[PDB]
Nucleic acid binder design. Sequence first.
RNA 1: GUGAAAUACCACCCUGGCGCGGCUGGGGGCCUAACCCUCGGAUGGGGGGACAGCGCUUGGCGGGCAGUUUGACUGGGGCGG
Length: 133
Amino acid sequence: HGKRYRALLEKVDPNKIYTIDEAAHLVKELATAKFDETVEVHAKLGIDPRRSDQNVRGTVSLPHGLGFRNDKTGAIHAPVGKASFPPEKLADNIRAFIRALEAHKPEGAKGTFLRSVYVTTTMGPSVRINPHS
RNA sequence: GUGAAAUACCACCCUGGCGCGGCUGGGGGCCUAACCCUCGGAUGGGGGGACAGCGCUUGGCGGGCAGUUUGACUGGGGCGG
Ligand SMILES: [Mg+2]
Ligand SMILES: [Mg+2]
Ligand SMILES: [Mg+2]
Ligand SMILES: [Mg+2]
Ligand SMILES: [Mg+2]
Ligand SMILES: [Mg+2]
Ligand SMILES: [Mg+2]
Ligand SMILES: [Mg+2]
Ligand SMILES: [Mg+2]
Ligand SMILES: [Mg+2]
Ligand SMILES: [Mg+2]
Ligand SMILES: [Mg+2]
Ligand SMILES: [Mg+2]
Ligand SMILES: [Mg+2]
Ligand SMILES: [Mg+2]
């Protein structure tokens, strides 16, 4: 990685677990990218893909616009928009989509459903952050 | 573009791997100081040595011992039924 990214992860704690208002404004500083950032915030899952009775999908439209499914390995995939909308239009949206997403949990899903969440970019670094609060 | 998956900087993951560290389980070697043996002598020497022995605990072999069980009918009883 470049010094774009060498100055990047010197300013973030994957070490310290963080909350989601804490981590909402840290998204637009850590992209040293040219261009074009669509933000991706990712979560590992508490479910088993090896049974498709527990499989998940659909298409919903987020509140302010562009600007979900499980793989066979069982993690989360979806873009929430363009970098676009500023830090507190993110925190506004940051509790929005997942509380819409959680609704789809199958019954035979064993254990804590959101295993972790790292706010990141299509271009950028990893902070340990909580979907919780 | 004839394979359906796209060959970007990123994450979140799969799979084996190595690395570091955290909680760690298992082996091996040496040591002596507990513990054990010993020494005309000993607050010491020599030998064994964290084994062995002993406590609590686990599962097992276990007539060497112990307590008992080992039915009724029945032309006696058993055998047979
Ligand atoms: Mg030795
Ligand atoms: Mg000795
Ligand atoms: Mg010695
Ligand atoms: Mg001695
Ligand atoms: Mg000695
Ligand atoms: Mg012992
Ligand atoms: Mg007897
Ligand atoms: Mg017996
Ligand atoms: Mg009696
Ligand atoms: Mg009789
Ligand atoms: Mg008779
Ligand atoms: Mg008779
Ligand atoms: Mg008779
Ligand atoms: Mg008889
Ligand atoms: Mg008989």
